[PDB]
Structures are given as C-alpha cells and as structure tokens.
C-alpha cells in the first residue's frame, strides 16, 4: 500500500574540519616535509568528505548513503588518533533537530557541541534516516526492491538502536529530543517492524504456505503494536507516525487471521474459518473508519467479505459447523525474520582510513 514511515535527515552547519586538524599535525610533526604534508592532505580530504556527506540534502541512492557511511567510518577511526578527548582541538558541530521545527518566537531547535561523539551520533542518525528513505522508496512488487528494503530497514533499526545505547555517554550535555534514547529507541522498533513487514510481503509474493504467512504477519503486528504504544503519550515524531503504526498493527493482525483462515479451510475447519474471517473483517472495518486518510484497505476488505460471505453461505446450508468464539481459538504463532543490524566499523564498503599510517 506504499504507506511506510521514513525519517528526515538532520541539518548541520558547514564546518572547516581541516584547519583545527593540520594545526595539530604541524604541531606534533615539525617535519617540513611529506608526512606532515600527507596528513594535511588527508585532513583536507576529510573536510571535503564532511561537506559531501552532510552538506548537500540530495540523492536517495546508494552513493549518497555510502558517502554518509564512509564519513561515519572515518570519524570513528579518528577519535583515538587525535587528542579530541581534551578540548585542545577546537571543533564545534552544530546540528538541528530532525523533528522539532521550533516555534516562530525562538528560532529553530539547534544544538552546538565541541564533541566528536556528538558528530558521530548525528551522522549515524542520518545514515539510518537516509537508509529508511531508500527502503521506503523501493518497488515492493520486485524481489530486488524487497531485498533492498529488508536490508535497509534492518540497518536503520540497528543504527537507531546503536544511538540509543551510546548517545548519553558520548555527549557532555543532554541531546536534542530527536537523538535522545527514547526517540531513537522508538525509531529502531518502527524500522524493525517495517523490515518484518517486508518479509511478509516477500512471503506473500513467493506464494509461501499460508501457515507461515500468518506467523510472519502476526509477528509484524507485535512490532507495530509495541511501536505505537511507545508513541501513545508522546508527540515528538511527526503527526502521521502514530495513526500509521496503529493502522499497520490492525492490518497485520487481519492479515494473520486471513491467512490462518485459509489454513483452517484447507483443513475443513469451516467454523474456525468463519470466526477468523469475521475477526479480520472487524479489524479492517475499524481501520477503514479510523485511519481512512492514512491507508487504503478497500481491496483487502472486499477479499475478506467475499470469502466470509461464501463461507457462511456454505456453512449454513451444508456443513453446519459451529462458529467458535475468538477466545476459544488457538493463538496464531509468531515468526521473526529480522534483527537490528549491529554497527561494526567499517559499515561502508571498501573503506580506507585516511589516517591509517598514524
């Protein structure tokens, strides 16, 4: 239905990385030769890399993501090489909140810190955000598009989760709300839910066993449900996130019941088939009336009600199966195909540290 959540990238002001870095290189290496000149060169290339990674808000393709990924790898590889733990290298990174646009009475919501850990955290945020945007753009009617989305949602999930676990010790002060552990923990779960949904779409497209499709859908329902519960009392994410999560929780439960009902029919459990279709119809009716402007469930609704009408007609006239109450049905199982991908530098392809000989 192409109703996937993605995250906007954080904006940052342009910073001259070169000057504060080579000024230390000229200090520690009084050699007026080529080692000082090659570091100074690599420092010039690092400042250029920052401008390419976070200065141009463009290009939802892998080249832009790999540039972001490469710049994250480079910064992580530099914290030990340069005395950044002490504030003798003056470098201030200013980043704006990804979500809080700010009232027109106090400007935008910005934070400036002289911290590499702050820069790492915001850069990793944009890696995850851009990955979520690339995943959300994939054609899910194509197997390669599905695989790209599955990989990128799991990456985004693991990167938001890495920020959750490290942002506090990395920052001296308290972060903006967008990178705060509560926000990125919820984003991590949203991306994990969407990765699981992609596996459900993959299973449906490949015509897998309905028993398996039901367990994949049921697990996606659990992830969407957990995510929307973390948004229930928070207004930090954009307005459309909460209704979309609530809708997807119910759509996934309905998909689980629908595919479980097909299994029931195949087993000649006609009463159970009707009970599960009635539950799917109820869930889809609730989504159609509450979240109408966020999802389109008309085709699914017609499929359910065509199946439920035929089931009831034949059961009343032929089989006379008792239709069980929902609470007397056995629970649908759960199958999780997704994991939050850990961030292990290097996360970029063919990475080469610019300060490796140091």
């Amino acid at each position: 239905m192409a109703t996937f959540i993605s995250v906007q990238l954080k904006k940052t002001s342009e910073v001259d990385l070169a000057k504060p870095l080579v000024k230390f290189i000229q200090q520690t290496y009084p050699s007026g030769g080529e080692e000082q000149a090659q570091y100074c060169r690599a420092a010039e290339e690092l400042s250029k890399l920052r401008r390419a990674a976070v200065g141009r808000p463009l290009d939802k393709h892998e080249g832009a993501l790999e540039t972001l990924l490469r710049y994250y790898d480079q910064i992580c590889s530099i914290e030990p090489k340069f005395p950044f733990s002490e504030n003798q290298i003056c470098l201030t990174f200013t980043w704006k909140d990804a979500f809080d646009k700010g009232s027109l009475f106090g400007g935008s919501v910005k934070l400036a810190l002289a911290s590499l850990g702050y820069e790492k955290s915001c850069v990793l945020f944009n890696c995850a955000a851009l990955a979520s945007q690339i995943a959300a753009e994939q054609n899910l009617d194509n197997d390669e598009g599905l695989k790209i989305a599955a990989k990128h949602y799991q990456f985004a999930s693991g990167a938001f989760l890495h920020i959750k676990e490290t942002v506090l010790s990395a920052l001296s002060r308290e972060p903006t709300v967008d990178i705060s552990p509560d926000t990125v923990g919820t984003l991590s779960l949203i991306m994990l839910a969407q990765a699981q949904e992609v596996f459900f779409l993959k299973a449906t497209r490949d015509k897998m066993k309905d028993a398996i499709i039901a367990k994949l859908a049921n697990q996606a329902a659990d992830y969407f449900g957990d995510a929307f519960k973390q948004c229930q009392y928070k207004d930090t994410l954009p307005k459309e996130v909460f209704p979309v999560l609530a809708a997807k929780h119910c759509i996934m439960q309905a998909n689980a019941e629908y595919h479980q009902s097909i299994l029931a029919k195949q087993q000649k459990k006609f009463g159970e088939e009707i009970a599960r279709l009635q539950h799917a119809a109820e869930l889809i009716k609730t989504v159609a009336s509450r979240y109408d402007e966020y999802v389109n469930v008309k085709d699914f609704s017609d499929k359910i009600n065509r199946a439920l009408a035929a089931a009831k007609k034949d059961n009343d006239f032929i089989y006379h199966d008792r239709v069980p109450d929902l609470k007397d049905l056995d629970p649908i199982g759960k199958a999780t195909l997704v994991k939050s991908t850990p961030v292990n530098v290097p996360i970029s392809q063919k990475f080469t540290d610019l300060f490796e000989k140091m």
């Binding site: 695989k147 599955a150 990989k151 993959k202 897998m208 066993k209 028993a211 398996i212 195909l337």
Partner: peptide
C-alpha cells in the same frame, strides 16, 4: 514449514 522459514532467512545475501 520450519525449512520454509530457513530458506526465507537465507535470502538477505
């Protein structure tokens, strides 16, 4: 079933 899940798991390659 169980092997159907295993083949789906080995997909992201």
């Amino acid at each position: 079933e169980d092997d159907d899940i295993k083949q789906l798991a080995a997909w992201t390659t």
